[PDB]
Amino acid sequence: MNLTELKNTPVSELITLGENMGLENLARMRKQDIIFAILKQHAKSGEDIFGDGVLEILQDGFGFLRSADSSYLAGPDDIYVSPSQIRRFNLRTGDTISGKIRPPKEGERYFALLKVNEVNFDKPENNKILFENLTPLHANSRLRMGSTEDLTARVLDLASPIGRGQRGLIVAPPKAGKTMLLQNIAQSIAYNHPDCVLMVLLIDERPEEVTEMQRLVKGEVVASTFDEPASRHVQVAEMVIEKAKRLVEHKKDVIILLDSITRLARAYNTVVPALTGGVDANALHRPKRFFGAARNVEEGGSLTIIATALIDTGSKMDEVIYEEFKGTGNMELHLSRKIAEKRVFPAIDYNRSGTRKEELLTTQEELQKMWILRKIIHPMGEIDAMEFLINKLAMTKTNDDFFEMMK
Amino acid sequence: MNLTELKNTPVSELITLGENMGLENLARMRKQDIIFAILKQHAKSGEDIFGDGVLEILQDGFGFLRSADSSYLAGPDDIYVSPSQIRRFNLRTGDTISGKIRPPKEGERYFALLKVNEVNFDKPENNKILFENLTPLHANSRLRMGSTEDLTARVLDLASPIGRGQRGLIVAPPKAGKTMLLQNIAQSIAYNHPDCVLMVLLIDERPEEVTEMQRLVKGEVVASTFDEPASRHVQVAEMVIEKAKRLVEHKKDVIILLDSITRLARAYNTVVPAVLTGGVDANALHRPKRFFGAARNVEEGGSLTIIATALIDTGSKMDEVIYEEFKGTGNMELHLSRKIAEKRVFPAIDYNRSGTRKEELLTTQEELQKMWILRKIIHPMGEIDAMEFLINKLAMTKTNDDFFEMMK
Ligand SMILES: Nc1ncnc2c1ncn2[C@@H]1O[C@H](COP(=O)(O)OP(=O)(O)NP(=O)(O)O)[C@@H](O)[C@H]1O
Ligand SMILES: Nc1ncnc2c1ncn2[C@@H]1O[C@H](COP(=O)(O)OP(=O)(O)NP(=O)(O)O)[C@@H](O)[C@H]1O
């Protein structure tokens, strides 16, 4: 019917969709092959088979539309895109392309994009590239964050506010609520800021972890799992960032939530041609390139990346990578095992967190309100400081917390 | 008679049987060669011979029913399955195929599957692939575990709750009691969860070590010894995992106790072609990470739970790297300590490094609280001190008696 609608129906539903057409051996095939079979045996209409995907142009000059639902995993139901199709519309990889597709002529392997209907949600005939847009401190225009889930989001707003175009590092040791934090920021971005494109990127992950996120986030959730190779981790990431750049080129605000930059860096280290502690010096280039991408764009739009830096893992290499990303970001949230050990579960190291150019993300009144909060929480130890914030915040909502705790 | 019955009888019995069918010199034959003789010679009463095993589809398109009791080692007495029989039934490598079998005609080499009776213990024409079932966090159902054997099983239930579909990692140094721990979970699972399919998979093992395990475990014990090739270590593990996946596609709970994923990993590393990192091909850790990756709790029912040892402290650079690359992959981990072992305290569990993710899903709020209180009182305690204090406090009664008889 409609490829993406196909790619988004449950496997059983797809199976009984196939059998209703007369397709026999479907149950023992990969979801993609089932989709192919259904798409192929629906070759009975005239102008009625629609496709879409993010474009990936391989070195040999031809391209492939790949699907977000598959986290851009090369598959049988990839819509092929011709060199002469990329060239007629100045298409570059990352381009989200929509339109009519068609079965393979015999000798052909893949379904083919027949006519280009839409590029990047715009007329195919229509943009200055990301790399020559201007980079402001993306501190103007704040991304703000009843219930107790909103307690995390309220400490953040005081500890380390986020703007459109931030390059944030979530510095997280094991079991400190790194994931719940991300789920929270996601949920908060969805309710509060539905105007942004939300991309959650999961790199070296556990399969079950993946589907947990896929079921919470209102946005694009893309993932490779630890049982795919470094090549794939790299691929998935590089596919995401480009998609993000094309969308900024259209003056959108795009927000990537990255689970481990550090795992991503692992991948590049194994994938790149031939050290400081396991990790090649040349390797970190593309990771940094990726993080470096974040920016508020003067010409309009922004790309914001919040990435977790996994810390305290007993890996020399994880450590080296973190060292190597100090100073790159312009926000940090620090998570602490001590605060986690005790079950006090916002779990932020207040005195170690904070974003740069706070003043641009904030009304003058607020900033001064924040400075006294900081003045008072400063000498408190990690654990105290959180316990003190939760008891005082839970009484109210963010704003009235200061009025109330003045006199 | 029936192929499985024939190959589950002692060799002397088989020679006796065989001699008394007119079959000369075979006392010095390999058992399987003997089995082959007894079949080929029992080809008198036609339509009696039944056969079975796990299917491995080879590159050319035909397959072989291979048998768990030789740890899926290719043999004269493997049942040839035709390309057409695979196509007729949607058959897949890992399938458990029963039926009737027929002797080789002039110019073949194998008994052949002539009639298919059961496939995966269901009707031969009756299931969606592991790879597209959904993967909940493996905590919507628990697998719990007054003797001193049960000491281990209890200590385990407070440190590292296993649930249907866990990817557990047993990190162990040498002589730290990992084999006996393995044996203890095995016994705790059979006795306690007979509904779960238990497969114990041993890689690169000493021969007598195999036999010992083969005789304690109520369930499938497949192994490959250090005398067999890396290829063979790879073969056995791949056959076991595939069978596992196949049973989950039938809504069953399979459990794989895997001994030395690092060994499994060493095997792939020698078998996998060409970028080195401490001895080990980066490329190489893919297939083991895959083996482990498969552990999941399936949404549409059934589960694949996997518990694997990672060897550590062997003074092999390679073993260390393997362990690192698995750091993070699991959702339970039980650490063993040489420390606690040297001092002969046997349920030698580093309780403070052990634990599983999403505990809350494997326990009742009452249980979790009790457990969280236990963790508060153990945290500042050293490695050796902590088990002595846990054993001498469990050496009173059973599990709930622990807390109802500690809350003084
Ligand atoms: N905001 C919260 N409120 C209550 N409990 C929480 C909160 N955040 C995390 N936890 C819990 O602490 C646990 C461990 O969290 P988890 O999501 O595993 O952290 P993590 O940093 O993702 N772990 P890791 O996989 O090592 O990175 C949980 O099981 C939680 O329930
Ligand atoms: N629960 C227990 N009760 C009594 N003895 C135990 C127990 N667990 C381990 N041991 C003993 O510790 C010994 C060696 O244990 P074993 O299970 O062989 O270690 P291992 O982990 O298999 N070593 P290796 O295979 O070289 O890594 C014994 O000989 C034991 O008796």
Swiss-Prot record, chain B:
The keyword tRNA-binding does not apply. Pfam families: ATP-synt_ab, Rho_N, Rho_RNA_bind. The record marks K317 as: RNA-binding 2. Gene3D superfamilies: 1.10.720.10, Nucleic acid-binding proteins (2.40.50.140), P-loop containing nucleotide triphosphate hydrolases (3.40.50.300). Residues 48-123 form the Rho RNA-BD domain. Keywords: ATP-binding, Helicase, Hydrolase, Nucleotide-binding, RNA-binding, Transcription, Transcription regulation, Transcription termination. PROSITE patterns: RHO_RNA_BD (PS51856). The keyword Transcription regulation applies. One of its GO terms (molecular function) is identical protein binding. It comes from the Bacteria. GO terms for cellular component: cytosol; membrane. ATPase activity is inhibited by bicyclomycin and dihydrobicyclomycin. Facilitates transcription termination by a mechanism that involves Rho binding to the nascent RNA, activation of Rho's RNA-dependent ATPase activity, and release of the mRNA from the DNA template. RNA-dependent NTPase which utilizes all four ribonucleoside triphosphates as substrates. PANTHER family: TRANSCRIPTION TERMINATION FACTOR RHO. Each subunit has two RNA-binding sites, one at the surface of the hexameric ring, and one at the center of the open ring structure, where RNA helicase activity is thought to take place. This is Transcription termination factor Rho. It comes from Escherichia coli (strain K12).
